[PDB]
């Protein structure tokens, strides 16, 4: 009882910069500072952009702001708080059935707008800032136009699928792999987020 520990917070450690003509990853906090920030829950770093790179003590993945909520996957974040300038912030959405969690979007972030285009030509953004064309194949499935080893997609759960106009269509959840090659992806449709809200 006396020695029971607490899990740390999720910490923003970087972002996928989509502000210009060239997408690229940026690191904003190193591993040591990440560990300290996870324990205190106090992160005074400036946040920018729509897609954050996030970490716990044991995992790293992505998180995406849509309509003022920073969304990610439950299999990355669990029920963890997120670190923020004034201390840890509790999830405002948790849905293990959808593999979805969300926190109020951090000050300085920018939010994507949910797609209403009804378009099936999509783009997946990875933690390495690769922009991967994806053809929508169902409510929660899309095929990669150019399949890639699952190694390429690992660590990108929580990232966005976007339409041609840059609206959010979904949150990347899982890869569909045959013999280690991802030919398709599974995503949380933005309509499920909009409902959750
Ligand atoms: C050939 O068989 C297949 O293809 N079968 C497919 C399949 O299992 N794919 C697996 C392949 C795993 C190989 C690597 C794939 C590369 C990237 C991948 C984007 C990521 C990701 O990057 N993660 S990550 O690295 O950031 C990380 C780890 C730090 C966070 N996502 C996952 O890894 C998810 C997690 C779990 O999926 C769910 N876990 C949960 C857990 C919950 O509570 C704990 C609640 C709901 C939930 N819902 C789930 C749907 C398995 N997974 C898959 O992708 C399907 C989806 C079953 C059809
Ligand atoms: Zn759209």
């Amino acid at each position: 009882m006396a020695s029971m520990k607490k899990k740390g917070s999720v910490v923003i450690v970087g972002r996928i910069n989509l502000s210009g003509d060239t997408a690229y990853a940026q690191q904003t906090r190193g591993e040591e500072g990440c560990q300290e920030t996870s324990q205190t829950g106090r992160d005074k770093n400036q946040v920018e952009g729509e897609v954050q790179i996030v970490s716990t003590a044991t995992q790293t993945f992505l998180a995406t702001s849509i309509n003022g909520v920073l969304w990610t996957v439950y299999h990355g974040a669990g029920t963890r708080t997120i670190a923020s300038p004034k201390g840890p912030v509790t999830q405002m959405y948790t849905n293990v059935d959808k593999d979805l969690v969300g926190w109020q979007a951090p000050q300085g972030s920018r939010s994507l707008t949910p797609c209403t285009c009804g378009s099936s030509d999509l783009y997946l953004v990875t933690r390495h800032a690769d922009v991967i064309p994806v053809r929508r194949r169902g409510d929660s499935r899309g095929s990669l136009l150019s399949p890639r080893p699952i190694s390429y997609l690992k660590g990108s759960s929580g990232g966005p699928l976007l339409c041609p106009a840059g609206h959010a269509v979904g949150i990347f959840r899982a890869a569909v792999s045959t013999r280690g090659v991802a030919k398709a992806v599974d995503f949380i449709p933005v309509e499920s987020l909009e409902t959750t809200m």
Side-chain angles (χ1 to χ4, degrees), residues 94-117:
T94 314
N95 188 337
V96 68
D97 294 324
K98 298 180 183 175
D99 197 18
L100 181 69
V101 309
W103 309 266
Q104 62 214 52
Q107 193 178 18
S109 65
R110 294 172 64 85
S111 276
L112 299 168
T113 298
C115 185
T116 60
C117 297

Side-chain angles (χ1 to χ4, degrees), residues 3 19 36 81 84 93 95 159 162:
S3 59
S19 68
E36 164 64 295
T81 51
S84 91
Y93 306 104
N95 188 337
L162 305 174

